[PDB]
Amino acid sequence: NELVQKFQVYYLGNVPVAKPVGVDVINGALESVLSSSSREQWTPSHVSVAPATLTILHQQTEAVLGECRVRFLSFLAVGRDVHTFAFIMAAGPASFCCHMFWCEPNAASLSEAVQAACMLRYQKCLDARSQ
């Protein structure tokens, strides 16, 4: 199944965004969601990074909060505040959705794991299509 062990983070939720890429887009989404929530409202959760999908699950009860195919993840970033992580999905052909997280001590290891999954997936796809 997974590539690494799940990440214990807070799921801040998801919001629609106008564009598939940009740190300005993800930081606008982060500011909006942080302004309309408090730390107690935050959903403790973990992110499972598998080869083809990212799955977000409720803290240790492990219900499914979201699932995302790497091929439809258009962009990811760490926010200006180093605890925040976001990725943008193409929910459909012209429809974008931004998923956001609070990470302790920071978002370094989640973002690395997600970036690595993207880079690995791209090579596996190029290689599949060249055979």
Added chain:
Amino acid sequence: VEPEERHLSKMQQNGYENPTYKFFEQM
């Protein structure tokens, strides 16, 4: 400056555009 630290600043200033997305996008 550390490896985690340098990759973080890059993650913050530029983020990362998934090439897997663009691969299937240009098809």
